[PDB]
Amino acid sequence: TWLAAXRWAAAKXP
């Protein structure tokens, strides 16, 4: 997955 929050985004596992 990915932790997309606004104009940002981080990666995390699935």
PDB file of C-alpha atoms in Angstrom:
ATOM      1  CA  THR A   1       0.000   0.000   0.000  1.00  0.00           C
ATOM      2  CA  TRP A   2       0.911   3.671   0.138  1.00  0.00           C
ATOM      3  CA  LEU A   3       0.166   6.429   2.622  1.00  0.00           C
ATOM      4  CA  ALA A   4      -1.024   9.102   0.133  1.00  0.00           C
ATOM      5  CA  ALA A   5      -2.254  12.203   2.110  1.00  0.00           C
ATOM      6  CA  UNK A   6      -2.669  15.286  -0.041  1.00  0.00           C
ATOM      7  CA  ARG A   7       0.332  16.290  -2.117  1.00  0.00           C
ATOM      8  CA  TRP A   8       2.350  13.829  -0.070  1.00  0.00           C
ATOM      9  CA  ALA A   9       2.703  10.009  -0.121  1.00  0.00           C
ATOM     10  CA  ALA A  10       4.912   7.456   1.705  1.00  0.00           C
ATOM     11  CA  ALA A  11       5.204   3.688   1.124  1.00  0.00           C
ATOM     12  CA  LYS A  12       4.237   1.059   3.669  1.00  0.00           C
ATOM     13  CA  UNK A  13       3.980  -2.680   2.773  1.00  0.00           C
ATOM     14  CA  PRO A  14       0.825  -3.525   0.663  1.00  0.00           C
TER      15      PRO A  14
END
